[PDB]
Amino acid sequence: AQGLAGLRNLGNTCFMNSILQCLSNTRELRDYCLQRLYMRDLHHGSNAHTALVEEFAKLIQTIWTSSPNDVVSPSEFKTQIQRYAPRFVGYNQQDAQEFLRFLLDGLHNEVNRVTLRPKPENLDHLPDDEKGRQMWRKYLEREDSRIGDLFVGQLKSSLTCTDCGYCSTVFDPFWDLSLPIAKPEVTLMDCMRLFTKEDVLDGDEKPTCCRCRGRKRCIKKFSIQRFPKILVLHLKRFSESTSKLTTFVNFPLRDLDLREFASENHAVYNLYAVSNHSGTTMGGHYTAYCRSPGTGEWHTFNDSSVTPMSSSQVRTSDAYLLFYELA
């Protein structure tokens, strides 16, 4: 059995182990590491303060060459991530999505195919899809890596003035989607429908219409212009008061079909990993449930302990990040 190594907790580092296992079971990212394809994309050597991709790929290689129930230490890797992002120095608990964002940022910068980034323009003459394509091209001039090949999509936001009827569109890249908890019996599709719903911006939220030249009630709506190969869904388990929102969100393990949210008319995903947070907003504990890319069986990865589980045990109210791969 392959890739079934535990990761030693180093002192409140469950958040880091959870994400690492989710990444370890991200098949193409794992393969980029095992095939050492990153060595082609690094532009020069590292030193002791800059070897983030090196240490991340070596941890991955170690996990994928282990025997089941081996326990691997990610202490070297932690040294590199806290050098890149000093909020991770020391041994306080941290948020798994915050860690994900910083880690993928450092990995991407280090393997960015763009070695000297370029330094805006009026695209009103273009149809929407072509404006999207041009904005994507522009983003790729600055950010273009194997890591972005996997996680990056593009959101279209349409802002329509209820007075002159002008719809302003903007296209924002994304590397994950943080989704609101919707609604009883909440599904992930309800949460994505809430994310993308027409949102009426009125009262103290009236935008200034760039044609009426005053504050106007506008309708703002999202759709997905480009779907990423790996879609990370972050559930905003934060209630208004602050404390953790523990709602059971029913997400599917296969056939998450997001075609309804597309900007135009390949938006079917299968789950392969979950980062779980259990406990109080502070003092909680992270685990991961991951589908092995080779066998399709699920395992719970809880720091040192890797145990088998049924797929029926994957969906729980503690799920916090969902890792989906295009079918």
């Binding site: 915050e98 936001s157 903007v170 924002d172």
Partner: protein, 81 residues
């Protein structure tokens, strides 16, 4: 006679997925932005994280540093720890 509104507007997707509209300048720092979110949402700046184009926006940097333009959306999330 009022102080002027910011020259550019951006949105923030709040904890319930509804948007707020912020009056800002390119030169505003992320701390200024977090202060505006505090005004609208009542969430302490020290609990806020703002995501845009996969980047978590860092204090000390400006909107301009991240090439955040008109009508972009910042995604507001807190922490589970």
């Amino acid at each position: 006679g009022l102080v002027p509104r910011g020259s550019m507007q951006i949105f923030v997707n709040t904890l319930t997925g509804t948007h707020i509209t912020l009056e800002v300048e390119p030169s505003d720092t992320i701390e200024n932005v977090k202060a505006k979110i505090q005004d609208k949402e009542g969430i302490p700046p020290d609990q806020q994280r703002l995501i845009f184009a996969g980047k978590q926006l860092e204090d000390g940097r400006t909107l301009s540093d991240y090439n955040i333009q008109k009508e972009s959306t910042l995604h507001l999330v807190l922490r589970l720890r």
